Amino acid sequence: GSTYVQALFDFDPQEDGELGFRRGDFIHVMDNSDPNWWKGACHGQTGMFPRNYVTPVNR
Numbered sequence: 726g727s728t729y730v731q732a733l734f735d736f737d738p739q740e741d742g743e744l745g746f747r748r749g750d751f752i753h754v755m756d757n758s759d760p761n762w763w764k765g766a767c768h769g770q771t772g773m774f775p776r777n778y779v780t781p782v783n784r
Contacts, residue, residue, distance in 0.1 A: 728754035730765075730779035744772035752779050 732750040746752060746767045752774060756764040763776045 727783050728757075728765075729782050730754060731782055733778050733780050736774050736778045738772075740773065742772050744768075744770065744774040746774070751782065754779075 729751045732746050732748045732752060735747045736745060738745040744752070744765060744767060750767055753766040754763055755766050755771065757776070758764045758773070759776070761776050762773055764773055765771065
């Protein structure tokens with residue numbers, strides 16, 4: 726389907742397994758878990774990332 730976003734800012738991991746990307750990086754929202762936090766995938770690696778650190782592309 727379509728669950729991508731565009732990294733609003735740079736997110737450096739801060740958890741064991743977390744996600745790590747850089748502004749404009751399209752996160753792949755694989756499973757909206759939490760309101761301000763979600764599960765996704767980008768640099769060939771999945772993990773969690775603040776949902777407010779990204780922005781929808783299909784809108």
